[PDB]
Design an enzyme around this catalytic site. Structure first.
Site, short mmCIF file in Angstrom:
data_model
loop_
_atom_site.label_atom_id
_atom_site.label_comp_id
_atom_site.label_asym_id
_atom_site.label_seq_id
_atom_site.Cartn_x
_atom_site.Cartn_y
_atom_site.Cartn_z
N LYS A 1 0.74 -1.22 0.08
CA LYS A 1 -0.19 0.06 -0.03
C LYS A 1 0.65 1.32 0.00
O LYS A 1 0.12 2.54 -0.31
CB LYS A 1 -1.36 0.35 0.97
CG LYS A 1 -2.40 -1.29 1.10
CD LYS A 1 -3.97 -0.67 1.84
CE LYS A 1 -3.98 -2.07 1.35
NZ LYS A 1 -3.81 -3.46 1.59
C1 LIG Z 1 -4.96 -4.08 1.81
C2 LIG Z 1 -3.74 -5.51 1.02
C3 LIG Z 1 -4.74 -6.67 -0.13
C4 LIG Z 1 -5.20 -6.01 -0.59
O1 LIG Z 1 -5.25 -5.22 -1.82
P1 LIG Z 1 -7.03 -4.74 -3.09
O2 LIG Z 1 -6.37 -2.71 -3.48
O3 LIG Z 1 -7.45 -3.94 -1.42
O4 LIG Z 1 -7.75 -5.57 -3.71
C5 LIG Z 1 -3.74 -8.02 -0.01
N1 LIG Z 1 -2.44 -7.53 0.88
C6 LIG Z 1 -2.34 -7.40 1.75
C7 LIG Z 1 -1.26 -7.88 2.76
C8 LIG Z 1 -3.15 -5.74 1.85
O5 LIG Z 1 -2.56 -5.16 2.76
#
Ligand SMILES: *Cc1c(COP(=O)(O)O)cnc(C)c1O
Length: 509
Positions: A123
């Site tokens: 993120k």
């Molecule tokens: C938030 C998150 C996801 C999900 O991604 P989306 O954009 O919401 O589909 C998957 N893996 C990790 C490690 C995350 O922190």
């Protein structure tokens, strides 16, 4: 601005469209819809393979973003700076390095590592960019205020674990901004709390609310719904357009890494998904011209998406099944709506942007009433032209971590975090049934193994060579438990109290 640098709400029926800046700052639309460019920018193959294939992450980010952001809203210079500073905090020279043929050359399994940023979770790619964006837009505005009466934002939100870390590092130290994040005490693992409470920056202050997490949604939704609480209050969201936009860069980047030189230009992305933002960015690249296979949605037991793509029935579950991949444990995939808008527009509104808003708005209405809505076969048929999906159980999640550990070759003993595992598991199911090993599989690694020790440990306990501390825990992450924490407890889910603590910004926030 052209049709790609203008934005509208997935639920709007009005001819009006807003600017990039407005979509970004507003976040969610007044009517509850999400912003999206009515027209997806087209890049031709020549440009892709003659000019883009030779660019670095940062230069691709510029090329891509210029397509959705008008020069008027953000000049070349300013935009190139936002990108440079946004990704200068990444421990990889490439920002998002592609680890190719991890399992040898019997197949083409590549793992795209997206965890080289400040918080060791994917993120960061979005949040680093968005945070800088906010600072940039807020600045220009205040650039006219009189050092007094100069607006100031205050982001507030709750965290069930890691999610908050990303926001904190993307907003930490940004001018005229402040971040307050509530989290249930003792409910947050050590390493997630350390990342949050460790950061020195003043504009940040986490609140250790004594209660539950579902408790913190309300103890913060209240502050959110507002009251006499109008001073500019920011929001901790996953549906900002800037998020989708930032995430587009690495699909292009890795695509070229996986095909430059090589003779096979066929590549398939497998994306462990939650709210769909990550994979949706891959959808945009696909519609822009990236000649890739169907995007693979990989989910854990919370399979709202896998079920939809199979029946056309988008039904919210009652129970949020616990899994080894918590960050994907969701009831409703928020960004999915964005895809539905484009689907509805092509297969039910004959191109009419406005009837598309009507259609999508009615669907999310049925949701907030029957907790489920049915779509016409033409919708799921349209989606199946670009998407495939796989549901991965916990057993399979853990077993994939173990399988890759033994199976890996480049490098040997490659450790996967559970979220990536969900993805590699799906990736492997695909290699099996695709019947075309020439295809380049790029599986997204969304979290560094150190962020989820338990899953990794419990799966690799069966190996005498394994040692979390020797093979996983990063030095930079080892210092955390030894740095000064800046806690601040709030006993009882007192919305009144959450308010009061926020107020203590000691003027100098
Ligand atoms: C938030 C998150 C996801 C999900 O991604 P989306 O954009 O919401 O589909 C998957 N893996 C990790 C490690 C995350 O922190």
């Amino acid at each position: 601005p052209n049709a790609s640098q203008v934005y509208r709400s997935t639920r709007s029926s009005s001819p009006k469209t807003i600017s990039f800046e407005e979509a970004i700052i507003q976040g969610l639309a007044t009517d509850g819809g999400l912003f999206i460019p009515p027209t997806i920018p087209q890049v031709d193959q020549a440009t892709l393979f003659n000019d883009w294939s030779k660019l670095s992450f940062q230069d691709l980010a510029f090329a891509i973003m210029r397509l959705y952001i008008a020069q008027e809203e953000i000049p070349d210079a300013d935009l190139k700076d936002l990108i440079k500073r946004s990704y200068s905090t990444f421990r990889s020279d490439e920002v998002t390095p592609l680890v190719q043929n991890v399992t040898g050359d019997k197949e083409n399994l590549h793992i795209l590592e997206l965890f080289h940023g400040p918080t060791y979770a994917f993120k960061d790619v979005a949040l680093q960019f968005v945070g800088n964006l906010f600072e940039y837009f807020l600045q220009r505005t205040n650039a006219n205020l009189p050092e007094g009466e100069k607006k100031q934002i205050t982001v507030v939100g709750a965290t069930s674990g890691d999610t908050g870390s990303a926001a904190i590092y993307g907003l930490r130290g940004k001018k005229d901004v402040s971040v307050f994040i509530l989290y249930p005490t003792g409910r947050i693992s050590p390493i997630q709390e350390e990342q949050m409470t460790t950061v020195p920056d003043e504009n940040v202050q986490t609140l250790s609310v004594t209660g539950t997490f579902d408790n913190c949604q309300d103890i913060v939704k209240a502050i959110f719904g507002d009251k006499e609480f109008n001073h500019n209050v920011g929001a901790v969201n996953s549906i900002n357009w800037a998020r989708i936009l930032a995430q587009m860069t690495y699909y292009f980047y890795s695509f070229f890494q996986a095909t430059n030189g090589k003779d096979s230009k066929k590549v398939k992305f497998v994306v462990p998904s939650g709210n769909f933002g990550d994979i949706l960015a891959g959808y945009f690249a696909k519609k822009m011209g990236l000649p890739i296979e169907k995007l693979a949605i990989a989910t854990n037991e919370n399979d709202i998406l896998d079920r939809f793509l199979k029946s056309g029935l988008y039904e919210r579950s009652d129970k949020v099944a616990a899994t080894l991949s918590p960050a994907m444990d969701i009831l409703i995939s928020s960004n999915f709506e964005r895809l539905l808008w484009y689907l509805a527009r092509e297969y039910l509104a004959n191109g009419d942007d406005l009837k598309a808003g009507e259609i999508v708005n009615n669907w999310f209405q049925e949701l907030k009433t029957n907790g489920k809505f049915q779509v016409d076969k033409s919708i799921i048929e349209g989606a199946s032209k670009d998407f495939t999906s796989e549901r991965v159980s916990n057993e399979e999640t853990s077993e994939t971590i173990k399988k890759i550990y033994e199976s890996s070759v480049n490098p040997k003993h490659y450790i996967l975090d559970p979220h990536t595992a969900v993805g590699v598991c799906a990736t492997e199911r695909l290699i099996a049934k695709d019947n075309d090993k020439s295809i380049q599989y790029i599986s997204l690694s969304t979290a560094h193994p150190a962020k989820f020790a338990d899953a990794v440990n419990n799966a690799l306990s069966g190996f005498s060579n394994y040692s979390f501390e020797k093979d996983v825990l990063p030095e930079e992450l080892k210092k955390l438990s030894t740095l000064k924490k800046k806690l601040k407890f709030i006993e009882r889910a007192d919305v009144e109290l959450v308010k009061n603590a926020i107020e203590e910004e000691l003027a100098k926030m």
